[PDB]
Amino acid sequence: APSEIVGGVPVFKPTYEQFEDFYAYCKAINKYGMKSGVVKVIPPKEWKDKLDLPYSAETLQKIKIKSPIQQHISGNKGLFMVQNVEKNKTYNIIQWKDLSKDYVPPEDSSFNIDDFEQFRTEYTIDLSDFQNTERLKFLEEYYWKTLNFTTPMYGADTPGSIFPEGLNVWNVAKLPDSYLYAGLWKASFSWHLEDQDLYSINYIHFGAPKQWYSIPQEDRFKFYKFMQEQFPEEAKNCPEFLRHKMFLASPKLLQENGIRCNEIVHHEGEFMITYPYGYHAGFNYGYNLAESVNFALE
Template structure:
C-alpha cells in the first residue's frame, strides 16, 4: 500500500525529469493536447431552479460530447467535511487499492481494483492523501507518464461509499435546492422516481473520496442511464467522455486493441461491453484518437457538476485529495436507450439492476393519467419525453400482442393476472412485467415471451406450453 514516487518535492521532480527520457514526456504525450474540451454551461439562478428541465434544454447539444460541465451559480454554505465529520460522527469508509500502471498490451488490460485497503475517517484519509504531492502544472501528463512508466506504485480510492455530503440545513442554499443529489433521481421528471426500492448509486447517491491519481476506469452507466457528479471539495478531477454515437466504435477498439484476442468469443463487441462493466479497464485515450473514436475531456473543479449522457463511456482521475458525489437519473430521451440496454442485458444473461419494462409501463400510465386529468397534453407534459415513452411503449405492446396471440392458440395455456410485479426470466434474466409464462404444475421458474416456448421445459420436466400466462 505505497505511494511510489509521490512524496517528492518540486526540486526532486525537476531532477527526476532531467534523468528521464524527456522525449517520451514531451513528445509521446502530445496527444493530450489533441483531445477537445467538452461544453461548459453557466446557468443563471433562475435556470438553476429546475435541473432536469435545464438538462433537457442543453441535452441536444451536450450529448454529442458524451459529457458536459455545469457550473453551479449556488454554493454550499456547509462544506462536505463538516457534513461528514460533525453531522455524521460515525462516518468511516473502506478504500480500494489501485495499481498505478497499465497492463501490458496484448494482455487483458484489466487492473485488480478489488483489493481492499483500510478503513478511514474523512480526516484520516485526507492526511494520508496529502502526503502524496507533485508540484506539476500538467497533472494529465504526469498521470499518464506514471501509468505507462510507473514502478508498480499504488493509490487508494474511497469508491462507492454509501452516503451524501449535501447538507439539509435550512441555511444551505445548495442543499435546499433540487440539485441536492440525495433527491435528484426521484425528481418529478426522472423516470427513476418510479423505482420501488432504494438502490445505492442508482437512486441514492454515493461518495467518491480520492487522492492523487486515484482513478475511475472506463465504463458506461448501468442500463445506459444518465449520471450526475458533483465536486464537493478538494483537488480537480480530469474526465474523458465518449458520446453514445461512438459507443459501438469504442467497444470495437477496446475488443481488438486493448483486450487479448483469447477473449474474443462469439459475442464480439458485447464481450467488451460485459468486461468493461467490471469497471477495471483503464487505458490512455490516445488509442481512441488513433482509431477515429470521438473523445472529449473536462477538468472538474469544486462547485461544478459533470453530466454523463446515456451510453456515454467515461473515465478519469483525481489531481489530489477530493470529495465527489454521484447518482443516476433518467429523463425522456433515455427511454429508447434503456430499451436497447435491456435487450443487451438479456442477450448476455446479465441480471438487470432496474426493472425497465415496469418503469416504461408505469411512465406511460402516468402520461395517460396526466393527459386525461388536465385535458391538454401540450401545455402540461414534456412532449419529448412523451413521444419517446409512447414510441417504446407501443413497440413493447405490439410485441406482447403477437406473442400472446401465438400462446393463446394453445388450448393448454391459461391466462392469469400478474399480482407480483416484475419477475426475472429464468432463461435470459430479462425483467418480466407485462407477461411471462409459468409451469401450471409447479409454478417455479418464469420464462419470458421472447423465447420459443415450444423448446422450453420446466425443471419439473413438464412442457412450458402447459403453463399459465401472467
C-alpha cells in the same frame, strides 16, 4: 439553453433562474450530452452561497470511508487493465486527509467530536497548485507514463451525503441515493457506462480536481470494436466486458485510432453529468471528496 464554452466537452454556466429547475434544465439541454460523452455544469454564485462551509463537526464525523479499494494496474502503454484490491479497514475523513500524505504527486487512536471541530480548518487542501494548465498537463502525462509503478487507492462508493439537509435545490442527495468517493492521487476509474444506461451527476465537494475522458456517442461502436481488438480473449465469453472488467485507455492512443475522445478537468464545486451511451473514464489529481447519483429524465 446555450453552451458557454468547450474543452471538447460542453460547459454550462446557468443562472440560478434556469438552474433552479434541475429536471427542466436537464431536459432542456440533453441534445448536447447525447453528442459528447459528458457535460460540465458550473452552478451560479447565489447557489454556492446556499452551502454551509466549513461543514459542521458532525457533518465531517458522519463521513465514513467503507471498504477502500487499491488498484493494481498493468499494461504496456495506452492499454491497461486494473485489478481493484480489498481494504477490510475503514477510514474517516481525518484519516483519509492524512493517508493522502503517502499518495503525493510529483513536483517541478479513538476519535472525539472535538477532533472534527478542529479539523474544520484542515479538511481542504491547497488548490492554487492545480490552477496552472501546464501543471495539470504535467500530472496527466506523468500519470500515463507511470500507471503500473504504483497501487493507487480509491475511496470506493459509500452511501451518504454532505449537502445541507434543508437544501432542496439541486440536492444531488435528494432530487424530486447519493454516494461519496474518496479521491487520492492517481486513483482511476476505468471505462464504463452507467448501469441501465442512465444519467449521473458527479460533484466535487472539495479537494483536487478530477480528469475526465468521454467518448462521443457516435464513436461508441468504433470504441467498442477497438476494445474487442485488444483483449480478444474476452471478446469470446463476454457480451459486455467493458462493464465486467476494468480497462484503462489513453486518449492520445484512441485519437490515433479513429476514435474521438473528449477530455476535461473537473474542479471543486463543479458538476459533471454523464449521459446514456457516453463511455467515460479518468483519474483523480489527489485528495478529494465527491458525491454522485444516477437518475433518469424519461
